[PDB]
């Protein structure tokens, strides 16, 4: 017969064994600890409900299940997915574990049958004549929904739950017509609601269904075999069949526009199924005598094989490179042992209730779990011995949790099982309020600021009213596709969807159109930006992206391997990068021209060693994968360096102490869940943090007798910053105030040493004007947001900015910058085989003074060193140390003198905290987005002040500091800003190289951030 979904992983698009269609539509979800979900399943070959169907011939729900006695000894269980499950003749008091269908069958009484889905769900049946009707359904925690039938009709008239009651009205033929549910108001009188409405035709088929929000499904049939069904928006899926009998095989699937065609052929003499798509690519499934997949032949000529237990479990999967995945099962069909490729093993253990008790990783590390008599997971223990405790209520809801550090987290729910409140390890309480229909209407942050929600006609959110008075407005299809969105400042963005539900066009607040186009199969075939340029996609018969043509017209190719499916070679225009892997698909070698990067992995799939010709790096981990130790070996510019990082972590995997290679020990004092409340460099506390209920830094008491205070808005925005003499009785202050619009953009700044700074934005939050210091900067953008011109007191088709503000640019074949000629300096750049700036040549035109620089990177593209070679003024070999993604220190050797400076940041941002060298420590004072503005020494004096243009260029400042913005290091030799894995040009505010992430990041590959006054981070947007 037909397969069961518990065995095969992908066993049907519609149905691959016998060709049956089985879609499911949802009418209502009433909330509760046991939710009432009226999911209606259609099954083509279900003959059980043709004669007397509650919802028509071929419809079934979780509340309309039935167990039918057979002719001789036994039963058949009509499952929720419409599959007739055969059962053995149970006698009273017998329990049989159905291994073919993973079902525990017990006969509690003569007229009762009970089913359990491995204790995850329980269904009990009651005999009423020649059938066994479903009496009640049960949860793991014993929660119940009970079915009530009429005394004379025998129809399911109502269903009851701990708090909710659902009534079903029936016509003269026993088919459901209307569905009601009991509810009240804020108080007072009972209120009854229509929840579902059904329509039937002359063929007794369910032809129309309307849900609780008056959204309509439409159905069409051929001898009760569906030929079209529609989403709640009217968009449909059409089918055709091999005949009229219920055993007919569906041969065609297509949308209303004809696209997404699927063609099904059947090889009944070889037990094979051919499925051909809209581009004549064919996937061939081969089945055993029990209609389970044993082979899959894909459109690229590859075959996958599946070896099966006598119980239809998959015990082995063989891939076209003969790579194996082996599984072992108990007599309870639980996967005991996973034998991966390379023969590494993962093991599990189970109790009688099929719940995971122990997990062992390929490294032999043990994780354990404990359960109570009610089925809840009480404990979980890691291989280090730490334990997190969980306690539950009689309804099975998680009420309280204790972390390994002893921090207690608490929850509370309404009678509908909806999360009302959450309190962290610091008892900071978040709260939620809910509608009478279970929809969230209010959310209150731990600081008391309440967000409010309103819902449209279709049950989706209509507006979001925020604490600052700003309002978002939204528009949604009947099926939840966002149609329109309005900013709190009335900027309108519109989205359009084609006849299949695919996004076809996005319209900007400046009413620019962005187009999406699809091939005959429905894959994204082309884009069209606001400038009119095209991005092209190209796929193989197995949907692997083989080639792209960008808006630049740049061709990019991806040469995948056939047996392994791994990307062996990626070809950019005039460029090629080769890749090497192991049997586990882990990248072992990255080769291109003169460069080779290599990686080494442990048994637990962690990167143990990563080395190239300039840098060898070794990593050591604990059993929780925490980096306990790192050793960086440098080999550049004729100098050898070895830097060792050693880390200690608490039971929450938060690092308590780090001994950096220069010899200093850094300690972080944390509370609750890991919130840093203090930092100890060497044995002296450098700074302390007092934090609000949102764990934001409000007071920063510094070691230099200074106090930095930050006041936050009712939104998450920084309202004001103060710097006061914490110790002096006359607490002299340096201050700065911020002001924002309703959308969130920063409009004005007021500083103590300086004056008003004002930002103006267009309808795309793009900085067009910035006024400050008796001057005003203006910006102009093309449709694709390329900065065409800027000054202070046509289209860039292909997004490669060739000219701007008197500056001229020339680019690589890879789209990287090569030459930049601004009025007083000519610069030349060279790029390595991996896409990184390897050489810079700067020629001053006023003095003919040439200066070269070379850059060196590790296997993770972190720049580890650079050498500056002024033609007649010595050399400067600099080396960089990296604490993960943070620039730990920089050490420059100019002649016989070496000067090294270290850095320390807030843990989850690139906002710098201190600069230390000598035992001296200097404190940073940054803006709202982390751009350093001040630097104060040990004596409390401002030793360096930062001044920035509207694009962030360090203007003439009214020791020093090479850190700008967030994660941006100022390379003085080029005038460029080194970002994380990229390079930023402060003259035009764009990257001088395309984005490696690709279209996942932004359509324009050079854009940093529309506004450059706020909304900036090292990775960018």
XYZ file of N, CA and C in Angstrom, residues 676-837:
486
model
N 28.196 42.134 31.616
C 29.451 42.633 32.167
C 29.158 43.862 33.018
N 29.482 43.782 34.309
C 29.342 44.908 35.222
C 30.682 45.461 35.681
N 31.790 44.910 35.192
C 33.110 45.365 35.581
C 34.209 44.691 34.787
N 35.327 45.385 34.592
C 36.459 44.861 33.838
C 37.726 45.100 34.644
N 38.576 44.078 34.727
C 39.810 44.137 35.501
C 40.951 43.862 34.532
N 41.714 44.903 34.220
C 42.981 44.773 33.517
C 44.094 44.622 34.542
N 44.894 43.566 34.393
C 45.942 43.212 35.353
C 45.266 43.019 36.704
N 45.628 43.767 37.743
C 44.967 43.666 39.036
C 44.173 44.918 39.381
N 44.051 45.861 38.451
C 43.388 47.132 38.703
C 42.119 47.244 37.872
N 41.026 47.623 38.526
C 39.753 47.772 37.839
C 39.832 49.012 36.956
N 39.529 48.859 35.672
C 39.609 50.005 34.772
C 38.264 50.701 34.619
N 37.171 49.947 34.588
C 35.861 50.542 34.381
C 34.805 49.633 34.994
N 33.719 50.245 35.456
C 32.567 49.525 35.973
C 31.305 49.977 35.257
N 30.320 49.084 35.216
C 29.077 49.310 34.492
C 27.910 49.149 35.450
N 27.061 50.167 35.503
C 25.740 50.072 36.100
C 24.734 50.073 34.959
N 23.767 49.162 35.010
C 22.905 48.921 33.863
C 21.438 48.999 34.255
N 20.611 49.348 33.273
C 19.173 49.476 33.461
C 18.515 48.101 33.351
N 17.180 48.081 33.328
C 16.452 46.822 33.220
C 16.637 46.157 31.864
N 17.091 46.900 30.856
C 17.410 46.339 29.551
C 18.892 46.016 29.410
N 19.648 46.089 30.506
C 21.063 45.723 30.558
C 21.922 46.590 29.645
N 21.466 47.802 29.347
C 22.281 48.779 28.645
C 23.132 49.556 29.641
N 24.320 49.953 29.196
C 25.253 50.674 30.054
C 24.753 52.096 30.275
N 24.386 52.413 31.512
C 23.887 53.737 31.869
C 24.973 54.579 32.526
N 25.701 54.001 33.477
C 26.825 54.658 34.130
C 28.085 53.837 33.899
N 29.149 54.499 33.451
C 30.459 53.875 33.275
C 31.448 54.606 34.178
N 31.707 54.053 35.361
C 32.699 54.631 36.260
C 34.088 54.183 35.822
N 34.947 55.142 35.498
C 36.258 54.865 34.933
C 37.354 55.056 35.977
N 38.499 54.423 35.718
C 39.634 54.472 36.632
C 40.318 55.833 36.679
N 40.031 56.731 35.736
C 40.680 58.035 35.671
C 39.859 59.133 36.343
N 39.077 58.777 37.364
C 38.222 59.702 38.111
C 37.146 60.341 37.238
N 36.811 59.718 36.112
C 35.788 60.218 35.208
C 34.544 59.344 35.304
N 33.387 59.942 35.028
C 32.119 59.221 35.017
C 31.403 59.510 33.707
N 31.082 58.455 32.964
C 30.354 58.557 31.706
C 28.932 58.061 31.928
N 27.962 58.954 31.750
C 26.553 58.647 31.959
C 25.829 58.713 30.623
N 24.934 57.754 30.396
C 24.148 57.681 29.173
C 22.680 57.542 29.545
N 21.841 58.397 28.969
C 20.400 58.354 29.175
C 19.737 57.893 27.886
N 18.831 56.929 28.000
C 18.191 56.316 26.849
C 16.751 56.794 26.706
N 16.248 56.700 25.477
C 14.908 57.148 25.135
C 13.881 56.091 25.544
N 12.602 56.376 25.281
C 11.570 55.366 25.488
C 11.681 54.279 24.429
N 12.241 54.610 23.269
C 12.685 53.619 22.304
C 14.098 53.182 22.688
N 14.738 52.389 21.837
C 16.087 51.952 22.120
C 17.175 52.962 21.837
N 16.820 54.208 21.535
C 17.780 55.181 21.033
C 18.470 55.923 22.172
N 19.736 56.270 21.941
C 20.513 57.044 22.904
C 20.044 58.493 22.880
N 19.614 58.997 24.037
C 19.095 60.357 24.131
C 20.166 61.374 24.511
N 21.095 61.006 25.391
C 22.075 61.963 25.888
C 23.283 61.215 26.435
N 24.449 61.854 26.340
C 25.693 61.323 26.881
C 26.374 62.398 27.714
N 26.857 62.018 28.895
C 27.550 62.936 29.788
C 28.883 62.336 30.213
N 29.868 63.209 30.412
C 31.191 62.827 30.897
C 31.552 63.771 32.036
N 31.493 63.271 33.269
C 31.653 64.092 34.460
C 32.826 63.610 35.303
N 33.402 64.546 36.056
C 34.443 64.261 37.043
C 33.822 63.520 38.221
N 33.936 62.189 38.203
C 33.301 61.353 39.219
C 33.776 61.684 40.628
N 35.021 62.133 40.780
C 35.603 62.334 42.103
C 35.613 63.787 42.557
N 35.847 64.734 41.653
C 35.872 66.129 42.058
C 34.512 66.590 42.553
N 34.528 67.460 43.566
C 33.280 68.021 44.075
C 32.593 68.891 43.030
N 33.367 69.598 42.207
C 32.829 70.311 41.049
C 32.921 69.369 39.857
N 31.845 68.616 39.622
C 31.818 67.606 38.563
C 31.628 68.302 37.217
N 32.728 68.847 36.699
C 32.706 69.472 35.383
C 32.329 68.438 34.327
N 31.590 68.872 33.308
C 30.975 67.921 32.393
C 31.248 68.261 30.935
N 31.375 67.213 30.124
C 31.335 67.293 28.670
C 30.092 66.538 28.219
N 29.228 67.197 27.450
C 27.902 66.656 27.185
C 27.563 66.698 25.701
N 26.562 65.895 25.335
C 26.106 65.780 23.955
C 24.704 65.183 23.948
N 23.780 65.835 23.240
C 22.375 65.443 23.209
C 21.964 65.036 21.800
N 21.079 64.043 21.714
C 20.608 63.505 20.446
C 19.093 63.644 20.345
N 18.607 63.789 19.112
C 17.185 63.929 18.828
C 16.862 63.175 17.547
N 15.719 62.492 17.535
C 15.380 61.574 16.458
C 13.995 61.880 15.906
N 13.785 61.477 14.653
C 12.473 61.506 14.047
C 11.640 60.291 14.415
N 10.412 60.271 13.888
C 9.500 59.172 14.193
C 9.944 57.863 13.550
N 10.602 57.924 12.390
C 11.095 56.698 11.770
C 12.279 56.119 12.532
N 13.027 56.961 13.237
C 14.199 56.536 13.982
C 15.494 57.189 13.551
N 15.494 57.979 12.481
C 16.713 58.609 11.997
C 17.114 59.783 12.883
N 18.420 59.917 13.108
C 18.966 60.983 13.939
C 18.936 62.304 13.177
N 18.217 63.284 13.714
C 18.005 64.554 13.033
C 18.979 65.628 13.507
N 19.257 65.700 14.809
C 20.080 66.784 15.326
C 20.917 66.309 16.505
N 22.087 66.932 16.664
C 22.996 66.678 17.776
C 23.441 68.014 18.358
N 23.523 68.085 19.685
C 24.011 69.267 20.390
C 25.183 68.861 21.273
N 26.349 69.445 21.016
C 27.580 69.137 21.730
C 28.007 70.314 22.600
N 28.850 70.017 23.594
C 29.306 71.046 24.524
C 30.451 71.867 23.939
N 31.506 71.204 23.455
C 32.605 71.944 22.840
C 32.198 72.526 21.496
N 31.327 71.835 20.773
C 30.906 72.217 19.439
C 29.457 72.706 19.467
N 28.877 72.882 18.284
C 27.508 73.349 18.186
C 26.520 72.356 17.612
N 25.501 72.882 16.938
C 24.443 72.050 16.385
C 24.950 71.297 15.163
N 24.635 70.008 15.098
C 24.845 69.202 13.905
C 23.487 68.682 13.465
N 23.152 68.907 12.197
C 21.822 68.622 11.680
C 21.925 67.725 10.457
N 21.053 66.723 10.399
C 21.002 65.765 9.305
C 19.625 65.798 8.660
N 19.605 65.817 7.332
C 18.373 65.772 6.559
C 18.408 64.555 5.648
N 17.285 63.848 5.568
C 17.193 62.620 4.795
C 16.071 62.728 3.772
N 16.193 61.949 2.703
C 15.163 61.866 1.681
C 14.137 60.804 2.077
N 13.291 60.405 1.129
C 12.273 59.407 1.423
C 12.837 57.996 1.529
N 14.157 57.824 1.444
C 14.788 56.519 1.599
C 15.765 56.487 2.768
N 15.602 57.389 3.738
C 16.498 57.495 4.891
C 17.953 57.679 4.465
N 18.174 58.305 3.313
C 19.513 58.534 2.787
C 19.956 59.950 3.126
N 21.141 60.069 3.720
C 21.645 61.360 4.177
C 21.935 62.258 2.980
N 21.130 63.308 2.815
C 21.285 64.230 1.703
C 21.913 65.557 2.121
N 21.759 65.974 3.378
C 22.326 67.226 3.864
C 22.759 67.077 5.316
N 23.960 67.567 5.631
C 24.446 67.584 7.009
C 25.064 68.950 7.281
N 24.478 69.690 8.221
C 24.950 71.015 8.604
C 25.689 70.956 9.935
N 26.850 71.609 9.996
C 27.637 71.755 11.216
C 28.825 72.657 10.922
N 29.337 73.306 11.966
C 30.583 74.074 11.907
C 30.581 75.093 10.765
N 29.537 75.925 10.729
C 29.405 76.974 9.712
C 29.503 76.433 8.288
N 29.261 75.137 8.090
C 29.350 74.541 6.767
C 28.207 73.548 6.608
N 27.929 73.186 5.357
C 26.827 72.288 5.032
C 27.213 71.365 3.888
N 27.075 70.059 4.096
C 27.396 69.069 3.077
C 26.116 68.590 2.403
N 26.161 68.467 1.079
C 25.015 68.067 0.278
C 25.367 66.801 -0.490
N 24.369 65.943 -0.693
C 24.572 64.659 -1.348
C 23.486 64.418 -2.384
N 23.870 63.781 -3.488
C 22.952 63.408 -4.555
C 23.129 61.930 -4.869
N 22.015 61.238 -5.098
C 22.028 59.799 -5.315
C 21.263 59.452 -6.585
N 21.763 58.462 -7.317
C 21.039 57.892 -8.443
C 19.943 56.965 -7.925
N 19.030 56.514 -8.796
C 18.000 55.560 -8.343
C 18.531 54.376 -7.546
N 19.674 53.808 -7.931
C 20.268 52.692 -7.201
C 21.100 53.132 -5.995
N 20.950 54.381 -5.548
C 21.564 54.892 -4.320
C 23.083 55.023 -4.424
N 23.612 55.201 -5.633
C 25.025 55.515 -5.801
C 25.243 57.017 -5.665
N 26.193 57.402 -4.818
C 26.509 58.810 -4.576
C 27.122 59.412 -5.834
N 26.333 60.200 -6.566
C 26.808 60.739 -7.836
C 27.661 61.982 -7.616
N 27.269 62.842 -6.678
C 28.022 64.057 -6.406
C 27.781 64.497 -4.970
N 28.790 65.144 -4.390
C 28.635 65.786 -3.095
C 29.488 67.045 -3.066
N 28.948 68.101 -2.461
C 29.639 69.375 -2.342
C 29.275 70.015 -1.010
N 30.183 70.840 -0.492
C 29.929 71.565 0.744
C 30.367 73.013 0.582
N 29.882 73.854 1.493
C 30.008 75.305 1.382
C 31.475 75.708 1.290
N 23.832 62.021 -14.352
C 23.260 60.834 -14.978
C 23.328 59.630 -14.040
N 22.942 58.465 -14.553
C 22.873 57.250 -13.754
C 24.226 56.554 -13.716
N 24.535 55.950 -12.570
C 25.706 55.090 -12.452
C 25.266 53.676 -12.804
N 25.018 53.440 -14.091
C 24.545 52.140 -14.545
C 25.627 51.086 -14.346
N 25.254 49.973 -13.719
C 26.209 48.972 -13.300
C 26.766 49.175 -11.908
N 26.405 50.271 -11.239
C 26.713 50.558 -9.839
C 28.200 50.742 -9.565
N 29.043 50.755 -10.595
C 30.465 51.041 -10.431
C 30.649 52.550 -10.564
N 30.861 53.220 -9.432
C 31.009 54.672 -9.417
C 32.356 55.056 -10.017
N 32.333 55.623 -11.222
C 33.563 56.005 -11.904
C 34.047 57.402 -11.538
N 33.138 58.328 -11.228
C 33.507 59.699 -10.901
C 32.589 60.237 -9.813
N 33.135 61.138 -8.991
C 32.371 61.793 -7.934
C 33.155 62.936 -7.297
N 32.560 64.132 -7.275
C 33.095 65.282 -6.541
C 34.535 65.598 -6.940
N 34.814 65.523 -8.238
C 36.150 65.788 -8.730
C 37.129 64.651 -8.563
N 36.670 63.485 -8.122
C 37.510 62.307 -7.981
C 37.193 61.320 -9.095
N 38.234 60.692 -9.632
C 38.114 59.774 -10.754
C 38.581 58.391 -10.325
N 37.822 57.370 -10.711
C 38.076 56.007 -10.274
C 38.249 55.079 -11.468
N 39.054 54.038 -11.263
C 39.272 52.977 -12.234
C 39.238 51.652 -11.489
N 38.636 50.637 -12.100
C 38.295 49.424 -11.376
C 38.920 48.186 -12.006
N 39.038 47.152 -11.176
C 39.540 45.849 -11.576
C 38.494 45.105 -12.405
N 38.939 44.020 -13.043
C 38.006 43.108 -13.689
C 37.075 42.456 -12.678
N 37.489 42.382 -11.414
C 36.680 41.817 -10.345
C 35.729 42.837 -9.734
N 35.721 44.069 -10.240
C 34.966 45.147 -9.640
C 35.667 45.858 -8.503
N 36.903 45.482 -8.189
C 37.664 46.130 -7.133
C 38.298 47.420 -7.636
N 38.509 48.356 -6.717
C 39.142 49.615 -7.077
C 40.609 49.389 -7.418
N 41.083 50.098 -8.442
C 42.449 49.966 -8.923
C 43.184 51.299 -8.912
N 42.510 52.377 -9.305
C 43.142 53.680 -9.427
C 42.171 54.744 -8.939
N 42.669 55.680 -8.133
C 41.848 56.787 -7.650
C 42.643 58.074 -7.784
N 42.140 58.998 -8.599
C 42.804 60.271 -8.861
C 41.922 61.399 -8.334
N 42.220 61.867 -7.132
C 41.639 63.089 -6.601
C 42.629 64.237 -6.756
N 42.143 65.500 -6.772
C 42.976 66.633 -7.215
C 44.428 66.688 -6.750
N 44.741 66.247 -5.532
C 46.102 66.383 -5.023
C 46.804 65.058 -4.747
N 46.257 63.930 -5.195
C 46.902 62.650 -4.932
C 46.430 61.616 -5.943
N 47.377 60.848 -6.473
C 47.091 59.709 -7.334
C 47.422 58.436 -6.570
N 46.461 57.520 -6.503
C 46.604 56.283 -5.749
C 46.376 55.089 -6.662
N 47.158 54.035 -6.444
C 47.060 52.809 -7.219
C 46.971 51.625 -6.270
N 46.112 50.665 -6.606
C 45.843 49.529 -5.739
C 46.007 48.229 -6.512
N 46.451 47.192 -5.805
C 46.595 45.859 -6.370
C 45.914 44.864 -5.444
N 45.232 43.887 -6.033
C 44.392 42.957 -5.293
C 44.895 41.533 -5.483
N 44.862 40.751 -4.404
C 45.380 39.392 -4.434
C 44.381 38.451 -5.107
N 44.736 37.164 -5.151
C 43.918 36.167 -5.832
C 42.662 35.786 -5.058
N 42.487 36.282 -3.832
C 41.307 35.973 -3.036
C 40.359 37.151 -2.864
N 40.728 38.338 -3.331
C 39.855 39.489 -3.269
C 40.192 40.513 -2.209
N 41.438 40.566 -1.750
C 41.848 41.464 -0.683
C 42.922 42.420 -1.181
N 42.914 43.630 -0.627
C 43.867 44.664 -1.018
C 45.260 44.259 -0.556
